[PDB]
Amino acid sequence: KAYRGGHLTIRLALGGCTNRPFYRIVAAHNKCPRDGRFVEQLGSYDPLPNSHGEKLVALNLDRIRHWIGCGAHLSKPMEKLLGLAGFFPLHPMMITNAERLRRKRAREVLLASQK
Amino acid sequence: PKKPNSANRKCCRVRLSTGREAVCFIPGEGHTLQEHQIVLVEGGRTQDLPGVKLTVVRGKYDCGHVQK
Amino acid sequence: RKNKDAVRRPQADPALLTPRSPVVTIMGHVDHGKTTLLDKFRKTQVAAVETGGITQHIGAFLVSLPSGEKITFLDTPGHAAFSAMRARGAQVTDIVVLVVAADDGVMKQTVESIQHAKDAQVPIILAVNKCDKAEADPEKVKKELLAYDVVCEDYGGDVQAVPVSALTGDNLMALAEATVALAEMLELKADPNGPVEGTVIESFTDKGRGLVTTAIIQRGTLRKGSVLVAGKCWAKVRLMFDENGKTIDEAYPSMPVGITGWRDLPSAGEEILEVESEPRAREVVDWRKYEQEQEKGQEDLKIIEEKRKEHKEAHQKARKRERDSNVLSVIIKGDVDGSVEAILNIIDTYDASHECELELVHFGVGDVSANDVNLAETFDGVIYGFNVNAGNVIQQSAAKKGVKIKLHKIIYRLVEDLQEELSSRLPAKTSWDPG
RNA sequence: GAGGAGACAAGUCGUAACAUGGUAAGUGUACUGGAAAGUGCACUUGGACGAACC
RNA sequence: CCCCACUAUGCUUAGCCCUAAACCUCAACAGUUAAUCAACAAAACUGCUCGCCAGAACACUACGAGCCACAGCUUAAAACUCAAA
RNA sequence: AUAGGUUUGGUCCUAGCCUUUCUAUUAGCUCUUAGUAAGAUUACACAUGCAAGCAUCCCCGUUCCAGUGAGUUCACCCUCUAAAUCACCAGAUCAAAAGGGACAAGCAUCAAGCACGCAGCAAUGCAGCUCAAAACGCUUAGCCUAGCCACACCCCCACGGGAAACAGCAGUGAUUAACCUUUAGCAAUAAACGAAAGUUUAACUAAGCUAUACUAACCCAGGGUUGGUCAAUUUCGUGCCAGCCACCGCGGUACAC
Ligand SMILES: Nc1nc2c(ncn2[C@@H]2O[C@H](COP(=O)(O)OP(=O)(O)OP(=O)(O)O)[C@@H](O)[C@H]2O)c(=O)[nH]1
Ligand SMILES: [Mg+2]
Ligand SMILES: [Mg+2]
Ligand SMILES: [Mg+2]
Ligand SMILES: [Mg+2]
Ligand SMILES: [Mg+2]
Ligand SMILES: [Mg+2]
Ligand SMILES: [Mg+2]
Ligand SMILES: [Mg+2]
Ligand SMILES: [Mg+2]
Ligand SMILES: [Mg+2]
Ligand SMILES: [Mg+2]
Ligand SMILES: [Mg+2]
Ligand SMILES: [Mg+2]
Ligand SMILES: [Mg+2]
Ligand SMILES: [Mg+2]
Ligand SMILES: [Mg+2]
Ligand SMILES: [Mg+2]
Ligand SMILES: [Mg+2]
């Protein structure tokens, strides 16, 4: 398909089955379907904890660097994943969501104490 | 039927949905198919009838099952 | 096979019972002002907007009286043909308003309506209409009704007689007051909870909404998602609508509601019962179809045993055809099951078999379709459409295939055309008469 | 409109083929004929000529 | 079928027609007899190349095409039917 | 194929048909539960609802996603080089148009196509080019499936015309043997937009229906067959009739109805 415009993006294509999300990190042309063609698969992400209580994430760091150099964008979930991995700085929204959770927890703690 | 079998096999003439007219065999002991009635027809030739290659399916539309 | 049918719930307890609005069916003789009276009560003028000025459909309307009460008026066809429609209206009615023209007095259809009212065991209110015109003799009307057992109050008869003039809208207020009084005396109530019970008043196929049935609720509330079963058909209620087409959230008892989502078109007058779920509804439908199949199988066994005994007697002792000119094959297409049934009853009244046979190749509800044209071609028949459309493509195909499609919008016009065709097939004018 | 084929199926007229099938059979070709078919000219054995002399 | 008479025809010239059980029913070229070969027939094979065949009948047929052919020849199907041939 | 049945009075060979195996659709009879996958027959016509916004105005998007298979050797490799991303740049990535090569099935009873080539700056000159190694032509078919090509109601196109368009989700009429909800949510991923919190999304997610399939289970089992191929029939009724058979065949007083 002769795609008018568009650009590469490193994003999480969703696979798995119902109630069992699983992600393939794909450097795919942004306009292509989420589960459609992709230039290269750069790793994986299992959101459901395994028996060891781990959320396995595979990152082909060399290829991710290559595609960032070639100009691929980064979807927000992938940016957050890289921030967690430490490959990138913690996302501002990761930090701000942590702060919001702390404030909500403090409010609920105050409510619980006032009982 | 063709020799050596002897019988009076029950058949009907149907205007199949494709526009062709064909003779359909009517299986089972006895039936009630009258003119103007709708039937479903499957393949499978009636061995002892020459030129008849359609069997009226029992229990569908206007052709009820055989009666015990 | 275990009996998995769905059966009308037993009469509700007085604690469950709750006041419900009354259903009044306006019945009478042709052109005696039933629809005009209904128009006056509804505040809307439809009598002018009609094909042939004839009511050919048992129509329901939820009128609201100025006092604030609500009444479900069923305006029924007055022609001789629609006996089944009149009987069904009498069956579903709580009260029967018999409209009799003061000018013309009692008539054959008036007597038929009175008989149906007696059979349904429903109170009768006489509305003597056309009182304005000279020779209007309500006293004569009452005296003649004495013969048919509709005794007025003046003669010590429980039936209330009301002189009205639907044309001038005079005394209709007192007619409505009498209707309200009779409803109060009847003290109509029904359970507004639990599985729904209703009656089909009409059925049809709408090109946008599917198989649509105009029903009247009798017990419990109907809502989107309820699973209904009526006769051999079932639905998951997809859209409930009113006479105006406005979607309505709930259908309380004695409300006329059009229901969509029927997997198959039910017959007019059949009972609608709610069931638990789709699998249960399909089980009920399969059981009912199986029961009908067993009945038909018993009858077919009788016929087949006749044939087989004949053949055995024949044997033990020894030890396509061109259709005649005097055979009119007809396809019948109606806008509603009621119209289809009316035409079929008219046909079944046929008695001129000797001179020319009248074969009914197929009948249905909806626009003349390619399959109808194919049947007509296969049987050199004629398609008769009652208030249905014949698209341009269908017309072209019928012209190519030599079929004759005859659309009509009036029952007696269609019947005149049918008798014309019978006479044409004759070797002269036909001897069968519709009435 | 009519013909052809196949099938079902009995009668009808003959007996053309299968034995040297009672005129050996058949191929091509031509004439002829209720009907298989007959004959003419050439060709094949998918016939025989019994297999010492007699 | 046997007997008699006679014509086309069998012959010559110049053109057509292009069919045969046109069969030795056994393709051309090269090679072998070694370890055999359904039956019959004219023993069994190897290498190589071309031509042809894929159940019976419909069918030396229909349609199309070509042809000095005009009741023709070459090429040549399909539908229906059968479990056989 | 590890094959089997069937030509005959009998044997051998050749051959066709059929049986046994595995899928998918439909139908008949029958059905308890849970998880998951998949789901109009049709490029015929469509009521209704929704499906594209974002945002300090401009811009950007609505060309994407989703859909169908009508059409059909625009899909693959190489050359060249547009558009787009890499905050501007850089060549890098991606990938149009153009050029070269490759690229489905059947019919040759489709064998000729009829200008289908070349040279020259041009003028104009040469008379050539394809084809039995299948040109030209007709019919059929979406393909080579991380997906790709084509279409977007028809007139290939779409200025214009015919006309008023679901082949977007749900749904419907017609049609077919073929027939799922006119559910909820943006909670996740993706896309659009924004500087951003965020907003929209019938994409998608999570649900609804369906024995179409796979997995798992229940202390509530049907369907088919029982002459041979092929596992498995007692007694009756019928008597070449009723009827049965995938093939061979059975039934004229039956392990085949
Ligand atoms: N003289 C007179 N005519 C009236 C009156 N009311 C109505 N009409 C007319 O009587 C005729 C019959 O009225 P309709 O309602 O059409 O008749 P109907 O009795 O319902 O009959 P169907 O057509 O069978 O339904 C019409 O022309 C009316 O306008 C009245 O009070 N007096
Ligand atoms: Mg009226
Ligand atoms: Mg002889
Ligand atoms: Mg002889
Ligand atoms: Mg001879
Ligand atoms: Mg002679
Ligand atoms: Mg020779
Ligand atoms: Mg010849
Ligand atoms: Mg010929
Ligand atoms: Mg010819
Ligand atoms: Mg099934
Ligand atoms: Mg196609
Ligand atoms: Mg041809
Ligand atoms: Mg277009
Ligand atoms: Mg459309
Ligand atoms: Mg849709
Ligand atoms: Mg439908
Ligand atoms: Mg299906
Ligand atoms: Mg017995």
Q: What is the C-alpha separation between C141 and C400, in angstroms, rounded?
A: 57
Measured in angstroms, the CA of B66 and the nearest CA of chain C are apart by 8
The answer for residues whose C-beta is within 8 angstroms of residue A85's C-beta and 6 or more apart is A57, A59
Q: Which of C65, C56, C51, C67 is nearest to C34 (CA)?
A: C56
**CB of C35 shorter than 6 A to ligand 1:** yes
**CB of C78 shorter than 6 A to ligand 1:** yes
* Distance between the alpha carbon (CA) of C407 and the C1' atom of F81, Å: 67
∠ CA C292-C294-C300 to the nearest 5 degrees?
A: 105
For residue A109, count other CB atoms closer than 10 A to its CB.
Answer: 10
Q: What is the C-alpha separation between C224 and C201, in angstroms, rounded?
A: 20
A31 touches strand F (CB under 7 A): yes
Query: Which chains have at least 3 CB atom pairs separated by less than 8 Å from chain B?
Result: C
Is A9 in contact with A75 (CB distance < 8 Å)?
yes
Q: What is the C-alpha separation between C189 and C166, in angstroms, rounded?
A: 30
Is C244 in contact with C233 (CB distance < 8 Å)?
no
A13 touches strand F (CB under 7 A): yes
| Two tokens, residue C168 | 């001038």
- Give the H or E element holding residue C228: strand C227-230
Alpha-carbon radius of gyration of chain C: 24
Residue C404, SS3? strand
Q: Which of C300, C359, C374 sits opposite B67 (nearest CB)?
A: C300
Q: Which of C293, C300, C362 sits opposite B36 (nearest CB)?
A: C362
Q: C67-103: string of b/e by CB count within 10 Å (b at 16+)?
A: eeeebbbbbbbbbbbbbbbbbbbbebbbbbbbbbbbb
- Concatenated DSSP letters for C67-88? TS-EEEEEE---SSS-HHHHHH
Q: What is the C-alpha separation between C26 and C180, in angstroms, rounded?
A: 15
Q: Alpha helices of C29-166 — where are they, by DSSP H?
A: 34-42, 83-92, 108-120, 138-147
Name the CA dihedral angle for A84, A87, A88, A92, rounded to a multiple of 10 degrees: 0
CB spacing of B36 vs C297 below 8 angstroms: no
| Two tokens, residue C207 | 């090109």
- Concatenated DSSP letters for B3-57? TT------EEEEE-TTS-EEEEE--SS-----TT----EE----TTSTT---EEP
CB spacing of B32 vs C374 below 8 angstroms: no
Is B60 in contact with B40 (CB distance < 8 Å)?
yes
- What are the backbone dihedrals phi and psi of residue C317, each rounded to the nearest 5 degrees, phi first? -60, -45
| Two tokens, residue C415 | 């019947």
| Two tokens, residue C386 | 């009652």
C265 CB-contact burial (10 Å; exposed 0-12 / middle 13-18 / buried 19+): buried
The DSSP 8-state label assigned to residue C355 in this structure reads T
Is A93 in contact with A80 (CB distance < 8 Å)?
yes
Chain B CA closest to residue C359: B36
Contact with chain C for residue B65, Cβ under 8 A: yes
Residue C216, SS3? strand
Full domain range(s) for residue A92: 1-115
What's the domain count of chain A? 1
- Beta-ladder partners of C60: C74
**CB of C129 shorter than 6 A to ligand 1:** yes
Nearest-nucleotide field for B50 (CA, C1'):
D7
Contact with chain B for residue C1, Cβ under 8 A: no
Q: C214-252: string of b/e by CB count within 10 Å (b at 16+)?
A: bbbbbbbbbeeebbbbbbbbbbbbeebbbbeeeebeebb
CB spacing of C293 vs B64 below 8 angstroms: yes
Where do we find the tokens 């050199």? C380
Residue C223, SS3? strand
AA identity, residue B15: R
Is C136 in contact with C144 (CB distance < 8 Å)?
no
Beta strands C23-28; C95-101: pairing state? parallel
Residue C385, SS3? strand
Q: Which of C61, C60, C94, C57 is nearest to C79 (CA)?
A: C57
- Give the H or E element holding residue C218: strand C210-219
| Two tokens, residue C419 | 């008798």
E strands, C340-397, in order: 357-365, 382-386
Contact with chain C for residue B31, Cβ under 8 A: yes
Where do we find the tokens 């789709």? C278
- Give the H or E element holding residue C173: helix C172-186
* Distance between the alpha carbon (CA) of C57 and the C1' atom of D29, Å: 86
∠ CA B28-B30-B33 to the nearest 5 degrees?
A: 100
Q: What is the C-alpha separation between C128 and C139, in angstroms, rounded?
A: 10
The answer for residues whose C-beta is within 8 angstroms of residue C48's C-beta and 6 or more apart is none
CB spacing of C304 vs B67 below 8 angstroms: yes
Which residues between 312 and 331 in chain C have a beta carbon less than 8 angstroms from any beta carbon of chain B?
Answer: 320
Q: What is the C-alpha separation between A4 and A27, in angstroms, rounded?
A: 18
Kindly report the length of chain B.
68
What resolution (Å)? 3.2
Is C27 in contact with C92 (CB distance < 8 Å)?
no
Q: What is the C-alpha separation between C317 and C339, in angstroms, rounded?
A: 52
The ligand with the least distance to the CA atom of C206 is 17
C327 touches strand F (CB under 7 A): no
| Two tokens, residue C248 | 């309505």
∠ CA C240-C244-C245 to the nearest 5 degrees?
A: 35
Chain C CA closest to residue B8: C311
Contact with chain C for residue B5, Cβ under 8 A: no
Q: What is the C-alpha separation between C65 and C184, in angstroms, rounded?
A: 14
Beta strands C240-241; C256-259: pairing state? antiparallel
Contact with chain B for residue C304, Cβ under 8 A: yes
Sign of CA dihedral B30, B32, B33, B35: positive
Q: What is the C-alpha separation between C79 and C107, in angstroms, rounded?
A: 11
Is C326 in contact with C356 (CB distance < 8 Å)?
yes
Is C262 in contact with C227 (CB distance < 8 Å)?
no
Q: Give the C-alpha distances (Å, rounded to integers) separating C251 from C69, C161, C223, C311, C426.
A: 16, 33, 7, 59, 53
B4 touches strand E (CB under 7 A): no
Beta strands B41-42; B11-15: pairing state? unpaired
Is C92 in contact with C216 (CB distance < 8 Å)?
yes
Is C217 in contact with C209 (CB distance < 8 Å)?
no
Alpha-carbon radius of gyration of chain B: 12
A70 touches strand F (CB under 7 A): yes
| Two tokens, residue A31 | 């306009």
Contact with chain C for residue B30, Cβ under 8 A: yes
**Strands of the C95-101 sheet, one edge to the other:** C59-64, C70-75, C23-28, C95-101, C124-129, C160-163
CB-CB neighbors (< 8 A) of B67 in chain C: 297-298, 300-301, 304
CA–centroid distance, C179 to ligand 8, in Å, is: 101
B67 touches strand F (CB under 7 A): no
- Give the H or E element holding residue C202: strand C197-206
**Strands of the C271-275 sheet, one edge to the other:** C233-236, C227-230, C271-275, C197-206, C210-219, C256-259, C240-241
Nearest-nucleotide field for B47 (CA, C1'):
F245
Half-sphere exposure of C147 (CA within 13 A, CB side): 9
Q: What is the C-alpha separation between C343 and C56, in angstroms, rounded?
A: 12
Is A70 in contact with A39 (CB distance < 8 Å)?
no
The answer for residues whose C-beta is within 8 angstroms of residue C61's C-beta and 6 or more apart is C38, C42, C72, C73, C75, C243, C256
Q: Which of A59, A61, A65, A62 is nearest to A12 (CA)?
A: A59
Measured in angstroms, the CA of B62 and the nearest CA of chain C are apart by 10
The answer for residues whose C-beta is within 8 angstroms of residue C194's C-beta and 6 or more apart is C9, C12, C16, C219, C220
* Distance between the alpha carbon (CA) of B17 and the C1' atom of F17, Å: 30
Nearest-nucleotide field for B49 (CA, C1'):
D8
| Two tokens, residue A72 | 């691929």
Q: What is the C-alpha separation between C150 and C126, in angstroms, rounded?
A: 9
- Concatenated DSSP letters for C255-297? -EEEE--BSSPPPTTPEEEEES-HHHHHHHHHHHHHHHHHHHH
Q: What is the C-alpha separation between C161 and C150, in angstroms, rounded?
A: 10
C10 CB-contact burial (10 Å; exposed 0-12 / middle 13-18 / buried 19+): exposed
**CB of C34 shorter than 6 A to ligand 1:** yes
Is C331 in contact with C373 (CB distance < 8 Å)?
no
The DSSP 8-state label assigned to residue C229 in this structure reads E
The DSSP 8-state label assigned to residue C248 in this structure reads -
Q: What is the C-alpha separation between B30 and B45, in angstroms, rounded?
A: 19
- Beta-ladder partners of A14: A23
Which residues between 39 and 78 in chain C have a beta carbon less than 8 angstroms from any beta carbon of chain B?
Answer: none
SS3 string, chain A, reads: CCCCCCCEEEEEEECCECCECCEEEEEEECCCCCCCCCCEEEEEECCCCCCCCCCCEEECHHHHHHHHHHCCEECHHHHHHHHHHCCCCCCHHHHHHHHHHHHHHHHHHHHHHCC
- What are the backbone dihedrals phi and psi of residue B43, each rounded to the nearest 5 degrees, phi first? -80, -160
Contact with chain B for residue C379, Cβ under 8 A: yes
What are the respective helix, strand and coil percentages of chain C, to the nearest 5? 35, 25, 40
Is C18 in contact with C194 (CB distance < 8 Å)?
no
Q: How was this structure determined?
A: cryo-EM
